[PDB]
Amino acid sequence: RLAQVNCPLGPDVLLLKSLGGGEELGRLFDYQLQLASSDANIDLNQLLGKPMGLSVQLDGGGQRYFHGIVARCSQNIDTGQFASYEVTLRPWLWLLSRTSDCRIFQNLSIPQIIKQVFRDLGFSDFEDALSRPYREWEYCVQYRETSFDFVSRLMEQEGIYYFFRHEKDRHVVVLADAYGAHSSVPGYASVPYYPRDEQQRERDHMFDWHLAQEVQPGSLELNDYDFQRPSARIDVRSAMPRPHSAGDYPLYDYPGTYVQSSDGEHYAQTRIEALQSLHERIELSGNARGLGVGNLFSLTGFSRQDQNREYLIVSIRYYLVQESAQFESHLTCIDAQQSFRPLATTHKPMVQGPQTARVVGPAGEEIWTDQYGRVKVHFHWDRHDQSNENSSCWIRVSQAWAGKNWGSMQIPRIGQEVIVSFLEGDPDRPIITGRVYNAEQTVPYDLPANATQSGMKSRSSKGGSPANFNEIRMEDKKGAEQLYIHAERNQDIVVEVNESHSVGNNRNKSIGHDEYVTIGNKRTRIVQHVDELRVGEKKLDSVGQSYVIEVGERLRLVCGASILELNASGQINLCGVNISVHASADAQINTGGVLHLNNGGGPGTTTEGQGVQGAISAKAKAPFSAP
Amino acid sequence: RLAQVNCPLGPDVLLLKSLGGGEELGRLFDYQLQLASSDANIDLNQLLGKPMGLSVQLDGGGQRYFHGIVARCSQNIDTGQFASYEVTLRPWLWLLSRTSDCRIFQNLSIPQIIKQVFRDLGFSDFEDALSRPYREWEYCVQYRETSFDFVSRLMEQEGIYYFFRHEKDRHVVVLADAYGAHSSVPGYASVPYYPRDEQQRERDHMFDWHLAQEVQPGSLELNDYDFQRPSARIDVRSAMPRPHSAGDYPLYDYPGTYVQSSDGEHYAQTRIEALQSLHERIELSGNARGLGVGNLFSLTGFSRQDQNREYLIVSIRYYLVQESAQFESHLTCIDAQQSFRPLATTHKPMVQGPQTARVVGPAGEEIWTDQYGRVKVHFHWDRHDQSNENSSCWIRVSQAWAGKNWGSMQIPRIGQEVIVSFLEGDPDRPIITGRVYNAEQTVPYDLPANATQSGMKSRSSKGGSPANFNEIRMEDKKGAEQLYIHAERNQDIVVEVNESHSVGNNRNKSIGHDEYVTIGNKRTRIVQHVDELRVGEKKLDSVGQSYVIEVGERLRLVCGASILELNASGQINLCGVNISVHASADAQINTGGVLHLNNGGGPGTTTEGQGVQGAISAKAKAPFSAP
Amino acid sequence: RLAQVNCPLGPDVLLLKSLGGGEELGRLFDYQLQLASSDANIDLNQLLGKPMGLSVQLDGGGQRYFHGIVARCSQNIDTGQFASYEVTLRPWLWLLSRTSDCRIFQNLSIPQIIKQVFRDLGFSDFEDALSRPYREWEYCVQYRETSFDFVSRLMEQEGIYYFFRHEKDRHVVVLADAYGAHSSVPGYASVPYYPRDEQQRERDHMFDWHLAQEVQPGSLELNDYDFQRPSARIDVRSAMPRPHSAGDYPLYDYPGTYVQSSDGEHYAQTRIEALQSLHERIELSGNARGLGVGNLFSLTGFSRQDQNREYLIVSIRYYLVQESAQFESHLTCIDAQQSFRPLATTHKPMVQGPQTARVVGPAGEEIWTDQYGRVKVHFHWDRHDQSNENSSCWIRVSQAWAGKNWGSMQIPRIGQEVIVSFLEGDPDRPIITGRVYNAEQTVPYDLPANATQSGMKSRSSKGGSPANFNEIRMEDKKGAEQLYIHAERNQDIVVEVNESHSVGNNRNKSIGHDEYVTIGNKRTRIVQHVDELRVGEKKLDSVGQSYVIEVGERLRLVCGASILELNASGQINLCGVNISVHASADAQINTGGVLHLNNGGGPGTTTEGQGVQGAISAKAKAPFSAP
């Protein structure tokens, strides 16, 4: 006879007064029940959220069901036996609009991602009709979004849609991506057309019809960059130009998240097919009780024979009114030979600016990175992942300069905070555009005083203490402008050609051990005034030819009391305490004057206290006394 | 009897034909008057924007008022005595949607911020019922927003709402945040229910009713980062789970502007309570002339005894039609035991990308910064603040590298332009992600020529001239690849272990004064071919043991004419002009040949012009002649 | 008599049943035809997109046309001879909403830009009534936008609008920016008012009227920055305060893309005039068949004599119903003395985050930049431009530090990838906030091993090999902390005052050729233990005064067998193989002991194998043997 409700209160406690609402592929059904019951004092908290459905009799003894979730409950003034309620049914999938989070999914295909969302909320009542092997996303992010909003966006990108199968006590999100996911309802594989201007016909019929068509873009071209293939023409274009005029206007868009071109192809195909799904649609209305969204059904008895086609019900509106039945539906078909595809209804979240984030890596490591300088990151909004190498995509790091091998490298280390930023705000395409200090990652130089101290500083990777650092700090405090270069072990330097140094005043070089200097040709050292050398022991001058000492006033050789002296006045003192000249052959003396011996005119040696080892070692050790 | 208008034209000049519109908590009232007057030639500029109100008689001789601001004026075809006008009333607070600016508010609580907005526009007609001590925001920004849009967002974040008190000639924005701000209207503390199916009842009654309920999220969890507490679990969760099924679906969101966790708690509480305010609401309609938005009123005579409750009028629609009255209202209550809280209706402005901004600080300073390297900033859009240390929050600066103390520091100085950027686009959370040159902050190296000159440069902080700089510029112009390091005073260098230098050709080191070199063990200098030393005065070799000179061909000591010479052929010349050998004890000569004296075979001294002081000082001074 | 369709099927094949729709300045007309034809089997692909129009008879034998583009086609149930169709007409300009791209326009005025968009799509049917000489935008970007959406935004910024001229077979987008672009339709230069309460009047008349007015902001002030004029008060304010109260509330907004202040003036003027266009508008309805959007027409016979004015039809709705006529229009005028100006209806695209982009320049160059360090860029989404110096605005580059001349420079070179970012997301205001490596622009140091290697590296500009680089790499691998400085030619160094070096152990300095050292005063070298010098040839000590050698244990001069020795024990050996002392005057010996000769107590020379040239040259050459 008529419709009866299937509900936890017992089908007899509630009986439908009317029905409203509708359905659409990839969009939540929405059914405004209106019903009456003998109790005005029904606790709506018992109804609300709970599963409720309808039994609608079909001819041939079939039944149709409209199971769903009570998202709104309401009651309205009516006679006491017939207290009126206006429950809205929604799918369990609608409850995913009642929850939000931020969560990262990695190395998962979107069918696997969605089923994680469903299964974590206990929503088991889903089913798979998908036919493509979908891409395994390296990294997906739910961000500032509901679980339904995220879910819908992912399907819309891949061009998945969903439609529902309704049982007595279950309603099932069937995931669908092809004609083959659709089915023809028994006995409604054809629906006749018979107008309301006929006498009221015995079966179910489409009573009204309105074909509609629209100009829709004939092609889409998509590009994305790939830093691993920056030369590669990732550009891919999909085309379904229509026969009609203006059927060829092309669209173009930039970053389809795809990176492999053969994935982007289908992102284009779906984005066009969704608009091609608008190029033709067919309104109908009628009594097709058996038919539902995503069902198929041939048309019969239509006058325009182009319309005697198999149709895909993209959307339905339903009406029932009932006595204690009149059934009506209003619906939009498309030609089943054109694949449906959902629009980008589900507006993506975009991060309208940068993020901060801890850098992370394996528990014992200090840096975790790859051949492009990417890093793993823990976002401060991520609740779910353990702040380790699994907590992000490999994220590229910007560098102050970067070229073909060459350029500046400043690899951010584990625990360092970074300024992330997304390739369009797209949470799925992070990139790092800065590093930043914080009360943990403290500043090198205490800044309210040392604000003038610029320059880099390091800290040895593995277990580096604050004292194990290279540095090139640079203070330009007026009256204290200091360069300070530090190597915590060694400072190699190479120059292919010429060094220079130019120092207005002083230099102190301390070599706490040993210096080698190897000169390939020449040295030339020049002093305006004074040199000193001091040596606590020995000096050797392996001069392979000539050593010429060109003194101007006094050479004074010394060793203790033994003293050779050359005055520029030509007086020589060779005087000592014992002497033993020797020659294997001749020896001589000559004078233009008169050599004589023991004259007593030379009274003594020219000892001046120089060369006394005690002082000389002391003067050579003088820099190296203990602190 | 009926309603009369209160207006500057005189209450008798305008008389109401009808009324429309409604009210809602935290949202502007909106009242479509329709009225008639004997003048069709009313200058609407006189009406428009001006304060106008209604007097509505209440039983017991009371009056109700609907004072407001004429936001729209209109006239429409009618009989001459009854020229018809369709004035819309809006609040004075609505005029804040007619003004926009950008302005920064700092160290102010949102109640103080709003009253600044009101008081600056002269809108004195506001009032305070707030009960919480609100957080003192360190920094708030009106940006790309109206004064109403900004105002509403701030209240919605704190979970403030407002409702109006209407006088004859004033209407007052009452700020409200608790049940206690509401009041019970005299004589309408209860309203009976009596249906239209009763005979027309003598008092004021609710004639219709529709309870409604919705599934709403049972909890919200909020996180924000804090660079001053980056380890701290700022995470805070608020929960109000419902008894019904699906009453526990949790929400999560990231950055609530809060930083202190106990502030974020109430941001969650309000965001849930606003949705809990949707979990139950009660439509009514009836003649409750006395009741208005934010009033309280018990219900009586309802059948379902759960409904005999105190109710909070969250919203009202009003109708009057009049003769020269029929009053109707349609309204939504909530149960007064549940706190109202406004939704996030007021979409926040987000800066969809970075900003430029001058750096600023105290008038005599050059850098103004804190222990984390934050700075004050003058935004180019800020009109109101004097480009000093008060013109911003302490803004963190990104650095090319940053770690635990260690890392690169590049503190931006006063007058320098920076690339700002916001933690989500949120103007209240700026951060700096770059520095940039401009025609004032000119580039170091004139770039159309010197594009190859890389590297840092400095300029002494206090009063540094362009010549007072450290530098490490780095040109890789092919055929001119130059390192250039400069210290405007001193270049300290340390190496914990080993230096190296490796120079393919030349080195020039000039020490314009004095060099000390202190070697803790050994030196070893080696020359393939030639050394020279020149000294304008003195050299000292304090060799504490042995000095051995190992010559291979000719030692030639000299001082003027005095010359000692050692040839490797074993010939020695010790010849001078005067000589005086001396010994305290013996002396000797020996020959295997035959010593004899004045042979005349040695004809002369070996003078070669070496050691003549005039040349030697000159050759040592030769580098140091005047330019 | 009535209306007949002008269509490719022949005006007799289709005849109008009714008409709907309307028009608005700067907005696309939209006309829901309803028509009937003897064929239900009309291929809609023939109708769709094609040009179709109406002929409407005007009195005095005139005709009105409504040519347009069939954007939607539809058919609906009707009698066979009268199969009903519901074609929607849209402008050809509407097809620009059916195409999208990203394209950059440079050094073009917006009138030139738009005509490029039109002319590239073949849409010739546009016309120019513009009166201002518009600014020549340096750089405009279509991004994530349709060609209509982009087009509309550009006109709305300049405050251009458009209206249509309709022919039989053409409809023309007239670009308009002043009253003078409007025209008065013959015979409708005045339209009488005569109410429906009159007997049906013989001519065309406005049958109804509703004046409306609104509070609208009295002024707008605009600012933008200019890095070429960062001191300049680019601030410009436009004002049109109304006489009424609240007629002076000012708006302020930041970045009007203008840079020259006199351009920004008109951006304000238009943004206010558009809102001033809302301050007054006049609804009408009536039979003004001749009048259309953007037409002018005086009013006559109105009672309120303020309304007997010239009016500008800002918008129209049309209705026809027809027999085989009743014409109706509903319209909004403004007073023609107030310039119309379109609202910011067309929401701008904003880049909600950064972009990557290749750097580019002239084909033979390596760097292309200007006196501010700007660069040209090829965006990865740009399809149209050849990746050269024409492919972008001069884009500023952020630098890690930047000041008055001084600061760090890191000029990104041709082929380098950069992180772009926009001044608000505004695609017309790009800026670069980072550089990034990629599989082409490879990282300097192979990072999975060398992650510890920090520091800059270069690569000679013109044809630099990987070996032609300056470097300052900095490894802090624990137990290997290395500084490494490299100049591919020369390393100049200056210090204004003092150097220091402090090396815990070793130093090796190799000078592969020649070292000069020039000391302006003093040197002081001190060795705890040992020095060596080795020289393959010669050493010279031009000591202009005294050389004093202060030995402590043994001076041992040598040249082959010739040996002078000074022991600190006072024993001297002066012994050789031949000797020839000589003096121009006296010579002496003296002893306190007893000189005697050939005693045989000195048995031999003190030869020790030192000074043998073969060894000595070898020991000086020892560092320089072949590898």
Side-chain angles (χ1 to χ4, degrees), chain C residues 69-142:
Chain C
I69 285 289
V70 179
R72 182 192 304 288
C73 189
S74 173
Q75 63 180 199
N76 181 6
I77 287 292
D78 206 316
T79 62
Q81 171 53 18
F82 303 107
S84 74
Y85 300 86
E86 299 196 280
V87 175
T88 294
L89 307 178
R90 305 299 291 272
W92 187 344
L93 180 58
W94 176 85
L95 301 175
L96 273 53
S97 76
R98 301 279 68 79
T99 178
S100 66
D101 59 69
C102 307
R103 192 186 301 88
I104 295 163
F105 306 86
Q106 289 162 106
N107 306 319
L108 291 168
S109 67
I110 275 174
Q112 300 163 344
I113 296 176
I114 287 161
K115 297 174 187 178
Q116 281 184 5
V117 177
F118 296 173
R119 288 175 291 194
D120 287 357
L121 296 169
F123 179 26
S124 52
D125 303 353
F126 62 84
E127 179 172 302
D128 186 349
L130 298 173
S131 63
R132 288 184 289 171
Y134 287 83
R135 83 193 293 279
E136 189 203 76
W137 286 67
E138 290 199 328
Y139 164 92
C140 303
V141 192
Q142 179 169 341

Side-chain angles (χ1 to χ4, degrees), chain C residues 147-163:
Chain C
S147 297
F148 168 69
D149 189 13
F150 175 66
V151 157
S152 298
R153 167 172 62 101
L154 264 56
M155 289 187 297
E156 289 178 1
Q157 282 188 146
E158 293 300 333
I160 290 170
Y161 48 89
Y162 57 91
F163 67 88

Side-chain angles (χ1 to χ4, degrees), chain B residues 379-538:
Chain B
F379 294 88
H380 300 152
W381 54 250
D382 184 4
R383 311 165 77 221
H384 298 282
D385 295 325
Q386 309 298 357
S387 193
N388 66 26
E389 78 292 343
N390 304 281
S391 69
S392 72
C393 189
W394 282 112
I395 290 145
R396 291 168 77 200
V397 190
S398 64
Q399 303 293 357
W401 211 16
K404 300 191 186 189
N405 300 299
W406 72 269
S408 64
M409 189 114 72
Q410 303 289 21
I411 314 176
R413 302 201 181 159
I414 294 172
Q416 295 190 343
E417 183 178 2
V418 287
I419 295 178
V420 185
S421 70
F422 299 90
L423 287 185
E424 294 299 326
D426 180 0
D428 304 325
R429 292 295 176 264
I431 195 151
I432 289 155
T433 44
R435 295 60 152 189
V436 64
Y437 294 99
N438 65 50
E440 175 189 13
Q441 305 298 322
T442 307
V443 189
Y445 321 121
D446 304 276
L447 277 187
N450 297 283
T452 44
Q453 297 192 332
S454 169
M456 286 160 71
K457 183 177 179 180
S458 64
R459 182 157 172 186
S460 307
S461 172
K462 281 283 182 169
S465 75
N468 304 115
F469 58 84
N470 311 312
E471 173 171 64
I472 306 182
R473 82 174 177 78
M474 293 183 283
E475 176 153 27
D476 59 11
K477 175 64 178 180
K478 190 78 179 297
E481 297 91 317
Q482 175 174 8
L483 284 176
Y484 178 4
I485 301 104
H486 188 122
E488 171 58 21
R489 296 288 180 285
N490 44 69
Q491 177 184 19
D492 192 7
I493 305 186
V494 178
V495 180
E496 295 299 327
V497 187
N498 299 339
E499 277 185 31
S500 182
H501 286 233
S502 184
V503 185
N505 275 354
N506 182 299
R507 179 168 194 262
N508 182 321
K509 176 178 72 180
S510 185
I511 309 304
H513 199 65
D514 175 358
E515 183 181 60
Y516 299 91
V517 177
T518 63
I519 311 297
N521 171 248
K522 178 170 180 173
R523 182 167 186 242
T524 293
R525 166 179 162 218
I526 301 182
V527 181
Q528 284 200 42
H529 303 152
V530 179
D531 184 29
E532 300 186 40
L533 172 64
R534 313 182 190 167
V535 182
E537 310 181 86
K538 302 184 178 182

Side-chain angles (χ1 to χ4, degrees), chain C residues 193-209:
Chain C
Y193 184 85
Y194 293 130
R196 298 186 182 89
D197 301 323
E198 289 188 20
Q199 295 194 354
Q200 290 189 339
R201 199 75 165 91
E202 294 88 83
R203 317 238 183 183
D204 288 11
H205 322 280
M206 302 326 295
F207 280 83
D208 214 343
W209 164 90

Side-chain angles (χ1 to χ4, degrees), chain A residues 293 310 328 352 366 439 459 462 477 482 496 520:
Chain A
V293 156
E310 190 164 62
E328 182 163 39
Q352 299 91 346
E366 303 279 16
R459 182 157 172 186
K462 281 282 182 169
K477 175 64 178 180
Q482 175 174 8
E496 295 299 327

Side-chain angles (χ1 to χ4, degrees), chain A residues 492-510:
Chain A
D492 192 7
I493 305 186
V494 178
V495 180
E496 295 299 327
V497 187
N498 299 339
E499 277 185 31
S500 182
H501 286 233
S502 184
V503 185
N505 275 354
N506 182 299
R507 179 168 194 262
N508 182 321
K509 176 178 72 179
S510 185

Side-chain angles (χ1 to χ4, degrees), chain B residues 19-24 27-33 66-69 71-72 86-91 94 164 166 293 315-319:
Chain B
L19 176 62
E23 293 183 325
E24 176 178 6
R27 191 271 291 166
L28 307 175
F29 69 69
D30 177 4
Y31 287 138
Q32 286 61 53
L33 313 188
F66 290 84
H67 189 105
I69 285 289
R72 182 192 304 288
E86 299 196 280
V87 175
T88 294
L89 307 178
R90 305 299 291 272
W94 176 85
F164 300 88
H166 296 288
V293 156
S315 179
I316 298 171
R317 296 190 183 194
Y318 299 86
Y319 307 111

